[PDB]
């Protein structure tokens, strides 16, 4: 149990991790199915125990990199995995290797997911952080205070379509 | 609706899940699967762009002062509620509570807490600074006088507001209470968001169920074909399964592309409404609610946005 | 000052476009998407799809018609599915591009050919005018917008009392530098003396919340006195 094995029960075969499940089969039932017709629990033919099948962990391997024109140092994101199945950072978006966790929040440069971004900042190395939404501000609101601009700036912005 | 669910699917594991012979047969088809993954990744990047366009419209994260003298207008049900763990409003909490094989679901780049922070910033800016924070630096203005400006923007002189301020504040509070009660009572309101969620769920479920179809082969189980037939005939059967499952992926990806185009149109509409309707005051008829538009308040929602259109 | 600011802004646009190339990522994305689709379409010609050779001429020169038929059928199936995929992706992408083109046509009509009051539709700020510029497979708009710059705190009031009559400003807002009260246009500080030509009277002083007291200078009284 608790190990990625290529099992072969009575007639049904697969790969996964077998774990002690708490499902309650009926005495004549042999294996369970998910909502999408995928087998997830099997009753062991020798000892009448119910084993939950979880797929062997997998996911994409995403490489985070600044431009090679800038640097050739990269970080790797192992999506939706435990960091033990692989300077190692566990995030909601996966396991991040090669990037230094920072408590500062900056403007997002390279999006990773679940609020984590990455950037190449200084002696320079890859950093990972909770991205900043903006410079937090409080308006001086009161029931008799108004702000009126005494000057203006004519700005020309470029929009491309 | 603003965004879909960022779903990515791996061919080799979907079509030929952990099978050497099947993977070798799948190699003959070229870059079909590279381009499937490319299409799905483009969709997911577009989803993040949708959310960022709709919500990340405010430069600074404004916050309402602890003193709530808004001329009698009561925004307690839409402003953030620190008592809850996630800094969401009462109505945002109602909205969030009302919505219920190589397949990965990538998390959105902005978390729900960040979306709520953006909507909080937009509410604080609109309340404490009118439409000025969209044009430039947020300029404070008393909320009664801002409502006077909005009344003047629909062709009613500001003396009407100043003389009927108490009645107007009571009517606005009553309207907010009605919104609360409807969104607590009936779930038929958020059908637009629940339909997107359900459509995506049905699409993925059908995609998985397609792995139980023969497509003409002797069996839909691939190891069973391998253990039953000799390689020359197992090749034919596995090619049948590969053609069927590859067609299932192509159908799913095409359908997701079309649905994502629809969602991107909806998200562009939401971005336009946030810009012209929350950050300003719209003279476009019926674009911002049925009536003469006064102001609008955004609320985040599961994979979407909710606008509270205050109209005269 | 305004002419100088506009000229400086155009110069800064020149500097940005001659400095950083990341501005035209929107056009480059279209070009790269189409090129990648065509590259995939071409590379799909070199796949076997289960046939003995990816090259049609080799199968034709190597097999008798009965078996060449089977092999060519396999290749035809594969390549026809490749074109089906390419055309479907192109139709979806062309719908997206047509949405962008409709948006750009709307921006030209409402943004160059007129002055838009829609917020953030024509650049961030108060839209003044927009100048179109052609670009490879696209259009570039230079949105000249008015942005308020230097704001000063003021004390404000919804109305003022003169003789039991409540004066509201006609087009502007009552402000006070601390002692004297003025009426100013709400987007640019130019104080003005509160007169009956700047305000209008409606109702009495007992209703408006936040009303203050000041003298509304009647122009006609000094003329009558003189
Ligand atoms: C198959 O045989 C094994 C042993 O030959 C059985 O295992 C025993 O099961 C009983 C009841 O479950 C236990 O009390 C014993 O402790 C088990 N022995 C061992 C060594 O583990 C098993 O139950 C048999 N199963 C069937 C279906 O006949
Ligand atoms: C409004 O802002 C402009 C821009 O900062 C000010 O003009 C500047 O004035 C200084 C002092 O004379 C000059 O050195 C700059 O060259 C000017 N800028 C430009 C772009 O010409 C202007 O003085 C401000 N007006 C007020 C009333 O404060
Ligand atoms: C704004 O409205 C809310 C909701 O009606 C008010 O909160 C209620 O206040 C009463 C009286 O203090 C309490 O009995 C309720 O339990 C409160 N309800 C909730 C949901 O908190 C709030 O007092 C109003 N604010 C003002 C300034 O009147
Ligand atoms: C508010 O503005 C008024 C009007 O400009 C100021 O009063 C004038 O102040 C100047 C110099 O401070 C004097 O030369 C004038 O004679 C004053 N005119 C009147 C009618 O009093 C007033 O000082 C300003 N208040 C503040 C706090 O700046
Ligand atoms: C503005 O001026 C009026 C008139 O002088 C003030 O009204 C007076 O209020 C006091 C106390 O409320 C009464 O004792 C007087 O009788 C009122 N005047 C009259 C003629 O009846 C008013 O209070 C002033 N407002 C401010 C903010 O100073
Ligand atoms: C790297 O970027 C700089 C701009 O910062 C550019 O001038 C330079 O040409 C780039 N290098 C290459 C090899 O393109
Ligand atoms: C992933 O595995 C590690 C090691 O067992 C564990 O500490 C971590 O909690 C796991 N992930 C989650 C989300 O629990
Ligand atoms: C970041 O915050 C965590 C949580 O308190 C703390 O343990 C860690 O030392 C912090 N890192 C730095 C560099 O201060
Ligand atoms: C106006 O006053 C408030 C509170 O005194 C202050 O926070 C704000 O910076 C002031 N505005 C300006 C433009 O200085
Ligand atoms: C503004 O609030 C303060 C604080 O209580 C109060 O003293 C003042 O009368 C209020 N003014 C208006 C116009 O609401």
Specify the length of chain B in residues. Answer: 312
Burial class of residue A64 in the structure, from the number of CB atoms within 10 Å of its CB (0-12 exposed, 13-18 middle, 19+ buried): buried
Residue of A nearest to C98 (CA): A161
For chain B, the DSSP string reads: -----EEEE-HHHHHSTT-HHHHHHHHTTTTHHHHHHHHHHHHHHHHHHHHHHHH---SS-EE--S---STT---TTTS--TTSSS---HHHHHHHHH----EEEEPPSS-HHHHHHHHHHHHHHHHHHTTHHHHSS-----HHHHHHHHHHTTT--HHHHHHSHHHHHHHHHHHHHHHHHHHHH-SGGGHHHHHHHHHHHHHHHHHHHGGG--TTSS-S-HHHHHHHS-HHHHHHHHHHHHHHHHHHHHHHHHHHHHHHHHHHHHHHHHHHHIIIIISS---STTBTBSSSEEEEEEEEETTEEEEEEEE-
Q: Ligand 10 centre from B71 Cα, in Å?
A: 10
Return phi, psi of residue C80, to 5°.
-70, -35
Cβ separation of C153 and A145 shorter than 8 Å? Answer: yes
Are the C-beta atoms of residues B60 and B138 closer than 8 Å to each other? yes
CA distance C162 to C86: 77
Our answer on whether the CB atom of C215 is closer than 6 Å to any ligand 5 atom is: no
Instruction: Give the 3-state secondary structure of residue C30.
Output: helix
Tokens of residue C205, six digits: 């002083």
B12-to-A113, B18, C184 alpha-carbon distances in Å: 24, 8, 70
Q: Which residues of chain C have a CB within 8 Å of the CB of A151?
A: 148-150
B107 vs chain C: nearest CA distance in angstroms? Answer: 24
- HEC letters along A58-101: CCCEEEECCCCCCCCCCEEEEECCCCCCCCEEEECCEEEECCEE
Helices (H), chain C: 2-19, 25-43, 56-62, 65-107, 220-225
* Residue among A10, A44, A47 to mutate when testing ligand 1 (max atoms within 8 A of CB): A47
Asked if C145 and C122 count as a contact pair (C-beta separation under 8 A), the reply is yes
Mutation choice for ligand 1 from A28, A45, A46, CB with most ligand atoms inside 8 A: A46
The 10 Å Cβ neighbour count of residue C143 is: 23
> From ligand 4's centre to the CA of C153, what distance in Å?
17
- Resolution in angstrom units: 3.3
| Alpha-carbon span B156 to C43, nearest angstrom | 66
**Relative to the alpha carbon of A67, which ligand is closest?**
6
Residue tagged 């807002």 (tokens): C173
Does any CB of chain C come closer than 8 Å to the CB of residue B163?
Answer: yes
Residue nearest (by alpha carbon) to ligand 2 atom 28:
A151
Evaluate whether C142 touches A157 at the Cβ level (below 8 Å).
yes
Close Cβ partners of C100 (under 8 Å, ≥ 6 residues apart): A161
A112 is written with which tokens? Answer: 């990773």
Contact C89 B257 (CB under 8 A): yes
| Solved using | cryo-EM
Torsion-angle region of C145 (φ positive above 0: left; ψ -120 to 50: alpha; else: beta): beta
Task: Give the full edge-to-edge strand order of the sheet including A110-113.
Answer: A100-101, A125-130, A116-121, A110-113
């Amino acid at each position: 149990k608790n190990k990625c094995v290529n099992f072969n029960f009575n007639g049904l075969t697969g790969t996964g991790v077998l774990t002690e499940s708490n499902k309650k089969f009926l005495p004549f039932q042999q294996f369970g199915r998910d909502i999408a017709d995928t087998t997830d629990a099997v009753r062991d033919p020798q000892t009448l125990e119910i084993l939950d099948i979880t797929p062997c962990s997998f996911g994409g391997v995403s490489v985070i990199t600044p431009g090679t024109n800038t640097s050739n140092q990269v970080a790797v994101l192992y999506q939706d995995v435990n960091c033990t199945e692989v300077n190692v950072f566990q995030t909601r978006a996966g396991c991040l290797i090669g990037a230094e966790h920072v408590n500062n929040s900056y403007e997002c440069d390279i999006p990773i997911g679940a609020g984590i971004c990455a950037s190449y900042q200084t002696s320079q190395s890859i950093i990972a952080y909770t991205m900043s939404l903006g410079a937090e501000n409080s308006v001086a609101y009161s029931n008799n205070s108004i702000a009126i601009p005494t000057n203006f700036t004519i700005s020309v912005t470029t929009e491309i379509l | 609706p603003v965004s879909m669910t960022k779903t990515s699917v791996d061919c080799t594991m979907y079509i030929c899940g952990d099978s050497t012979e099947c993977s070798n047969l799948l190699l003959q088809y070229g870059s079909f699967c590279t381009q499937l993954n490319r299409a799905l990744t483009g969709i997911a990047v577009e989803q993040d762009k949708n959310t960022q366009e709709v919500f990340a419209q405010v430069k600074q994260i404004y916050k309402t002062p602890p003193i709530k003298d808004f001329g009698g207008f009561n925004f307690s049900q839409i402003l953030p509620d620190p008592s809850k763990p996630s800094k969401r409003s009462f109505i945002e909490d109602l909205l969030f509570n009302k919505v219920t094989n190589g397949l990965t679901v990538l998390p959105p780049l902005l978390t729900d807490e960040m979306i709520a922070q953006y909507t909080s910033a937009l509410l604080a800016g609109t309340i404490t600074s009118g439409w000025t924070f969209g044009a430039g630096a947020a300029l404070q203005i008393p909320f009664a006088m801002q409502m006077a400006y909005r009344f003047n923007g629909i062709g009613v002189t500001q003396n009407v507001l100043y003389e009927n301020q108490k009645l107007i504040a009571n009517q606005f509070n009553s309207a907010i209470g009605k919104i609360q009660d409807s969104l607590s009572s009936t779930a038929s309101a958020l059908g637009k968001l629940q339909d997107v969620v359900n459509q995506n769920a049905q699409a993925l479920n059908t995609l998985v169920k397609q792995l139980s179809s023969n497509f003409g082969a002797i069996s839909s189980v691939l190891n069973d074909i391998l253990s039953r037939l000799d390689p020359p005939e197992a090749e034919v059967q596995i090619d049948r399964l590969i053609t069927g499952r590859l067609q299932s992926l192509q159908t799913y990806v095409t359908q997701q592309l079309i649905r994502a185009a629809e969602i991107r149109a909806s998200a562009n509409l939401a971005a336009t409404k946030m810009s012209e309707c929350v950050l300003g005051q719209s003279k476009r008829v019926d674009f911002c609610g049925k009536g003469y538009h006064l102001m609008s308040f955004p609320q985040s929602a599961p994979h979407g946005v909710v606008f509270l259109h205050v109209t005269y | 000052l305004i002419a100088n600011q506009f000229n400086s802004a155009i110069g800064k646009i020149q500097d940005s476009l001659s400095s950083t190339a990341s501005a035209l990522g929107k056009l480059q994305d279209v070009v790269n998407q189409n090129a990648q689709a065509l590259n995939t379409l071409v590379k799909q010609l070199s796949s076997n799809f289960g046939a003995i050779s990816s090259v049609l001429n080799d199968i034709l020169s190597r097999l008798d018609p009965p078996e060449a038929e089977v092999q060519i059928d396999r290749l035809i199936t594969g390549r026809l599915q490749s074109l089906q995929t390419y055309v479907t992706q192109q139709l979806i992408r062309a719908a997206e591009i047509r949405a962008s083109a409709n948006l750009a046509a709307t921006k030209m009509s409402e943004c160059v050919l007129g002055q838009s009051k829609r917020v953030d539709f024509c650049g961030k700020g108060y839209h003044l005018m927009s100048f179109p510029q052609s670009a490879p497979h696209g259009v570039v708009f230079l949105h000249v917008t008015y942005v308020p710059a230097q704001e000063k705190n003021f004390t404000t009031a919804p109305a003022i009392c003169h003789d039991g009559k409540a004066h509201f400003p006609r087009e502007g807002v009552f402000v006070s530098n601390g002692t004297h009260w003025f009426v100013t246009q709400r987007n640019f500080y130019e104080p003005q003396i509160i007169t009956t030509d700047n305000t209008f009277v409606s109702g009495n002083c007992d209703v408006v919340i936040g009303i203050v007291n000041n003298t509304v200078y009647d122009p006609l009284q000094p003329e009558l006195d003189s």
